[PDB]
Design a protein around this ligand. Structure first.
Ligand SMILES: O=C(Nc1cccc(S(=O)(=O)N2CCN(c3ccccn3)CC2)c1)Nc1nccs1
Ligand SMILES: O=C(Nc1cccc(S(=O)(=O)N2CCN(c3ccccn3)CC2)c1)Nc1nccs1
Lengths: 216, 791, 239, 158
């Protein structure tokens, strides 16, 4: 609710889509090719050869890119699924994804957006740091860091972002020469844990009234 | 990718501390995962030589040694089983400060005087080896500080590489990066050609030139495989997490980690008339060096001879064609394999190697020859032998080529949000070995070097500038937007609104897994085939839910088992109906209640929750957008619910959901002793409501009449009230059912209904005659439809 | 095979009440703007003649300032005739950009049947560098379509207001086939100047609308006296 | 044309109970929102606030609309009795608005939330007890409001 509000207050529309998706919207349309390890049964839950449980909310954004022409300002909160679960990772979890597509969008616009959302969400004038990373759907891509103010150099990795890759727009019939765009993603449980001081991820899905009653 | 900093600095020296370097690397996209020292601290330990040894005359487990430090000979008593004349060892002199504050002093062991201590790797915190003394190479320089000799003033840095930086999978690659970042000279290993001592070769065939456009082969005759891997190579490999196995494998691994070219050596005797690089035949069988018997697909590229397959090209060698104890002659291989032709092939056979990783990520298409000469020199130095000439097979038409890219200064300024000077643009790109040439005003033509498989577009060049300039040095702006006022329709009840309503009504929100146990699915939904996962995490998490009830009931009982008695839960989420073909994914709102009606308190009655308590909570939700009148609760039936206490909720005939008591039989199976009430609604059918339409208020008083009615015990109260409205006239402003009686004072097959009828005329007072006339015609109507009676 | 059967009888307890129609209206107007970067501003109900008149180019001799139209406490203190003083307080407290909506209770002395001595109004103010009359037209046109949930036709007629130049009366379709619903205009240079905002650098538009007027159109309410009477028979219609 | 805007993501603090939130809470708890005139009769003002001098208008529309309110109670009680006089027995009203404290020099204009209840505890129905509302029913409605931002423990009823 809190993440949505940060954006819906500045013209972003909330987008929703299906949980059971196809390999095109979930991978192909996001520059993740066939042989990519993310597509393996080790990381993705499959029903058959082409139908799966969405690994991220990006397919909702793809469905928007195909259905409409720019401008696009959307936030996609939702349940996502990963096969490669353990103690630190859950087979089901929530994530929010953003997408802005317009005519003069720069990397500076992306930095400004991400920096102001983190300050808003965490209610502190914290320091934000961007580190170069690699994602198949974005170029340039970055890993976002904030200071250990909410508790190894006093930095924490909280989210990812990047400028939408030209082939990603092209595939969804958006001319990369005319339009530019930025996208991002963040884990809801990760943010909840930082905000409220929650230690064990297993607490969220247990539904003990002794845990839940603490958030009244 | 783990490496020795000392080794990196020998190629590119940034001239900044170790801490400054580990910092910058992560800031440029090479994230450091670990940085650890190579050994423990110590002083006064030097290379010593054992000149002579004698049996200690008063201790059999001890020896008396004469050890030289190149300047003086010292007597030292030693108990180590491996101590013997000729040995080069770490000699701790009287004065030496060893790990964990241990100072070496003069000793007299069983009557014999000792002037120092000879060391093991464990004693010096070099390795975990405490078996005996650390035997240093025969050619070690005596007198030299062991820390200097063993280069113990070093760190090992571990980098988590992104799949686009295949080039950095070697020290050659990492050094090139460091030189570009810091703008410092790159001093690469000079690799001279090894001149052929004979003319013995083997033929080489490129039967699949697209998959392998370059293959190099060399014959090395009469090698002594008994000879050991030199310490410098062992230490360099150890500092990259590579275990020393044999001199030949150690050289091929060393070269791969130094230059980035995976190489292989075959037993020359195992090559039946030269090499044939081709696709495998379907079902062709190969036994790998590890023992695994792989059955190959026609899409897989293999290295074969004129008789059989020898290895799975770029991934792993075969058992029959590897080096062994019998091996006297080698055949070296250095090739370029297409990244596409190999992508996912190692994984499909359940394999992963350092060779497979490098080729898939991309190996420099021009590197094979430099790497071949380098490996040849090393082989001759380690195991000897006589080299033959290099055999190079190359398909020029299949060699990789990246079309020159046109970079526009305008586009860099746009993306970065600030301009960069042409000299800075050129300087930066050139440092990464890119070929920059001007192509008009504010435009260039850039060429990509043979080690970069990730550069092909203008945006890739802009990324490179951003990265090297520094992401955090770049400006911060907020995106512009031509926005217009907008809003969603007034008369709609959204999920956030409904969630807050239920919270106010004393509910707690739950979140349960979408995938559940088929046994549970079957209990709440008998006969239905769940949408089953192909690869569930476990067997009890294999069925996509058709209802939010199994999960809620499960969370309710988890709490009941944890000393909770009053449980009120609600959840929103999707349900999955049908099989893939025609699958329906519908958002639902569901709730579950049990225990006392109210919390424990001095002013609260001790009554337990029932059907009508849940009904109230449902009515409140259904009334959220001023459309409660559109909903009707009809006596229904559901397999998971009590047949006597189930309501089917409808809107214009369409099914909205169900409300009822959990079936007692289900409770038994689930080990539930308390009554539990469930409701589930299709949000699609709840959300739409109606905008208020003002109706003028009368200035005249209202008139009320009460009615006590006797009807069949099984006639629904809603049926009676519907009939009343039908016969009450236009002026009826209210109809309230204020009492239901079914006891002793009346027949046990009948019940009494006390109703309050209210009327108000819009423009006058209502007279008693007309009201009495209406009241009687309501009664007459009820006597004809339900055979009603007045109490 | 136990008879614990029951029926379709009403649920137990208390159900939800409701909001006042004016509250629904104000909430709805705010949302149309707060969704696109406008901040909700509030100020005092008892104001001074400077913020209420002077700062908005309403001079001393202006009939609006007379005791016939304005409620006074003394010579300089009054009950605000509009929410514009809240916007003035913002212009003095900060430099552009400014994007604010000001919903609130306002007071007029010259009451009757068709007019109430107390009523609610919303006022907007946007102040930035390149603001045109086209920007104003676009904003007003899109808000009306959003609020009334129809792709209706919008008409602008030239009018006069002391605080704006050019000023317009806004019409929507429904004896003339058109209805006057609100006013707007480009903020007068002297208004900005007085509040230390350079008219040469910055431009701005403002607008106003009556909440009861909008509520009456939306819900089909006939008598304005119904809003302040608080009869449960009236209020219960907006649950 | 539509005006352009370089906008940044933003939000108000998480742990705050705003008036729109509290209004909706009271609605769920079965209250009806009222809107009363700010100016009231001095006689009424004096009954609910003895000793205090109201901030009086120079030109009131009428003599019984000459005093700026110091409490939302006179208006609510008046709306409650208007309904009681119009064949209503269960009345549950709430209002938000400013109060005016003191004279022009040092006048305080403070936003208040006030509520008034009378009649039966529950609506007339077959499953509802016929008991009348009391102090503890109002207390429950107040506790719910005071607990809206997880700080109920900070409040004490003395
Ligand atoms: O671009 C995005 N999303 C995006 C952008 C950057 C970072 C992240 S993130 O940190 O959540 N993470 C990064 C790592 N992830 C990867 C990496 C490789 C393969 C798959 N997954 C998971 C998501 C999400 N979406 C789009 N939709 C339409 C067009 S673009
Ligand atoms: O400019 C405005 N508001 C504005 C603009 C146009 C029309 C209207 S309106 O239709 O509500 N109406 C017009 C008629 N009114 C008049 C006319 C003359 C005197 C007093 N009142 C009442 C308000 C409000 N405010 C500012 N604040 C700060 C700077 S500018």
């Amino acid at each position: 609710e809190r993440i949505e509000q940060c954006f819906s207050r500045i013209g972003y529309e909330v987008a929703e889509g299906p949980e059971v998706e196809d390999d095109y919207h979930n991978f192909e349309a996001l520059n993740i090719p066939g042989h990519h390890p993310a597509r393996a049964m080790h990381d993705t839950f499959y029903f058959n050869a082409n139908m799966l449980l969405r690994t991220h909310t990006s397919p909702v954004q793809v469905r928007t890119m195909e259905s409409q022409q720019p401008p696009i300002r959307i936030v996609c909160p939702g349940r996502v699924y990963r096969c490669d679960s353990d103690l630190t990772h859950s087979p089901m979890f929530h994530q929010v994804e953003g997408l802005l597509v317009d005519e003069g969008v720069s990397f500076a616009d992306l930095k400004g957006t991400i920096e102001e959302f983190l300050r808003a969400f965490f209610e502190k004038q914290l320091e934000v740091r961007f580190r170069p990373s690699f994602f198949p759907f974005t170029e340039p891509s970055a890993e976002v860091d904030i200071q250990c103010v909410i508790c190894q150099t006093g930095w924490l990795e909280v989210m990812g972002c990047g400028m939408v890759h030209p082939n990603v727009l092209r595939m969804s019939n958006i001319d990369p020469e005319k339009f530019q765009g930025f996208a991002f993603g963040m884990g809801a449980e990760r943010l909840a844990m930082l905000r409220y001081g929650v230690n064990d991820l297993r607490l969220f899905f247990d539904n003990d009234l002794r845990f839940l009653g603490q958030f009244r | 990718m783990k490496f020795s900093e000392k080794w990196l600095r020998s190629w590119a020296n940034p001239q900044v501390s170790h801490d400054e370097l580990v910092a910058r690397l992560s800031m440029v996209g090479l994230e450091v995962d670990a940085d650890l020292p190579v050994a423990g601290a110590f002083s006064g330990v030097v290379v010593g030589e054992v000149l002579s040894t004698e049996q200690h005359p008063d201790a059999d487990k001890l020896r008396v040694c004469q050890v030289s430090n190149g300047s003086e000979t010292f007597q030292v008593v030693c108990g180590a089983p491996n101590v013997r004349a000729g040995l080069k060892i770490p000699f701790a002199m009287i004065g030496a400060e060893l790990p964990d504050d241990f100072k070496i002093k003069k000793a007299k062991l069983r009557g014999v005087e000792s002037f120092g201590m000879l060391c093991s790797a464990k004693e010096l915190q070099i390795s975990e080896e405490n078996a005996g003394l650390l035997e240093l190479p025969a050619d070690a320089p005596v007198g030299q500080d062991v820390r200097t000799y063993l280069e113990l003033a070093d760190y090992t840095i571990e980098v988590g590489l992104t799949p686009n930086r295949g080039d950095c999978l070697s020290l050659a690659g990492l050094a090139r990066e460091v030189s570009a970042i810091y703008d410092v000279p790159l001093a690469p290993v000079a690799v001279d050609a090894v001149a052929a001592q004979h003319d013995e070769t083997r033929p080489v065939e490129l039967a699949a030139p697209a998959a392998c456009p370059r293959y190099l082969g060399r014959v090395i005759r009469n090698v002594d495989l008994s000879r050991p891997t030199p310490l410098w190579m062992v230490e360099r490999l150890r500092r990259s997490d590579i275990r020393s196995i044999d001199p030949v494998v150690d050289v091929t691994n060393y070269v791969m980690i130094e230059l980035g070219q995976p190489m292989h050596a075959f037993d020359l005797a195992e090559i039946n008339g030269g090499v044939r690089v081709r696709m495998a035949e379907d079902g062709e069988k190969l036994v790998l060096l590890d023992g695994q018997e792989i059955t190959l697909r026609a899409d897989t590229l293999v290295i074969a001879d004129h008789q059989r397959a020898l290895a799975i090209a770029g991934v792993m060698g075969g058992e029959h064609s590897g080096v062994s104890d019998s091996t006297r002659d080698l055949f070296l291989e250095a090739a370029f394999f297409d990244t596409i032709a190999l992508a996912g092939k190692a994984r499909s056979y359940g394999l992963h190697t350092d060779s497979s990783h490098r080729f898939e990520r991309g190996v420099d298409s021009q590197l094979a020859r430099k790497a071949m000469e380098r490996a040849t020199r090393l082989i001759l130095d380690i195991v000897g032998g006589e080299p033959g000439p290099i055999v190079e097979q190359v398909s020029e038409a299949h060699l990789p080529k990246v079309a020159p890219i046109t970079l526009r200064a305008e586009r860099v300024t746009q993306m970065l949000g600030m301009p960069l000077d042409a000299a800075e643009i050129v300087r930066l790109l050139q440092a990464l070995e890119l070929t920059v040439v001007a192509d008009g005003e504010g435009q260039w033509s850039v060429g990509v070097p043979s080690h970069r498989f990730d550069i092909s577009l203008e945006v890739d060049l802009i990324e490179e500038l951003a990265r090297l300039y520094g992401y955090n040095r770049l400006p911060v702006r907020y995106p512009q937007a031509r926005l217009a006022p907008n809003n969603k329709p007034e008369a709609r009840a959204a999920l956030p609104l409904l969630r807050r309503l239920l919270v106010a009504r004393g509910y707690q929100e739950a979140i349960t897994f979408s995938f559940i146990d088929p046994a549970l699915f079957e209990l709440f939904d008998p006969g239905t085939q769940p949408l089953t996962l192909a690869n569930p995490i476990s067997a009890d998490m294999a069925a996509m839910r058709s209802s939010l009830w199994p999960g809620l009931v499960k969370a309710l009982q988890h709490n009941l088992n944890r000393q909770q008695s009053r449980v009120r839960l609600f959840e929103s989420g999707l349900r999955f109906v049908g099989q893939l073909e025609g699958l329906k994914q519908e958002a639902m709102l569901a709730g579950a209640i049990c225990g006392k009606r109210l919390p424990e308190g001095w002013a609260n009655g001790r009554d337990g929750v029932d059907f009508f308590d849940a009904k109230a909570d449902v009515e409140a939700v259904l009334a959220s957008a001023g459309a409660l009148g559109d909903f009707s609760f009809v006596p229904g039936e559901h397999p998971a619910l009590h047949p006597g206490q189930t309501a089917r909720i409808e809107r214009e005939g369409r099914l909205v959901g169900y409300l009822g008591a959990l079936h007692p039989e289900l409770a038994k199976k689930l080990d539930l002793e308390q009554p539990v009430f469930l409701f589930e609604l299709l949000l699609a059918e709840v959300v739409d409501g109606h905008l208020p339409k003002f109706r003028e208020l009368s200035r005249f008083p209202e008139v009320r009449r009460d009615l006590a009615l006797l009807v069949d015990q099984d006639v629904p109260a809603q049926d009676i009230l519907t009939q009343i409205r039908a016969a009450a006239g236009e002026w009826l402003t209210d109809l309230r059912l204020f009492d239901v009686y079914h006891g002793k004072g009346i027949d046990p097959h009948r019940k009494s209904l006390a109703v309050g009828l209210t009327w108000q005329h819009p423009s006058r007072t209502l007279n008693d005659d007309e009201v009495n006339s209406t009241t009687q015609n309501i009664v007459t109507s009820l006597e004809e439809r339900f055979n009603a009676t007045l109490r | 095979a136990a008879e614990r059967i029951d029926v379709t009888l009403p649920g137990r307890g208390q159900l939800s009440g409701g909001l006042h129609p004016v509250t629904r209206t104000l909430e709805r107007i705010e949302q149309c703007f707060s969704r696109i970067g406008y901040e909700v501003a509030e100020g005092p109900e008892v104001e001074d003649d400077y913020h209420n008149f002077e700062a908005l180019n309403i001079p001393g001799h202006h009939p609006a300032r007379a005791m016939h139209d304005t409620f006074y406490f003394n010579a300089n203190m009054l009950l605000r005739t509009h929410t514009s003083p809240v916007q003035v307080r913002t212009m003095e407290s900060q430099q552009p950009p400014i994007r604010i909506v000001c919903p609130g209770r306002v007071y007029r002395c010259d009451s009757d049947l068709t007019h109430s001595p107390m009523f609610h109004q919303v006022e907007g103010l946007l102040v930035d560098e390149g603001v045109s009359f086209a920007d104003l037209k676009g904003t007003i046109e899109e808000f009306l379509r959003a609020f009334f949930e129809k792709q209706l036709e919008v008409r602008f007629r030239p009018s006069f207001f002391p605080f704006t130049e050019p000023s317009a009366e806004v019409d929507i379709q429904c004896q003339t086939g058109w209805l006057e619903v609100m006013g707007c205009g480009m903020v007068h240079p002297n208004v900005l100047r007085m509040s230390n905002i350079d008219p040469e650098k910055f431009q701005g538009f403002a607008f106003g609308m009556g909440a009861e007027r909008l509520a009456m159109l939306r819900y089909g309410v006939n008598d304005l006296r119904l809003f302040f009477d608080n009869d449960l028979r009236f209020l219960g219609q907006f649950r």
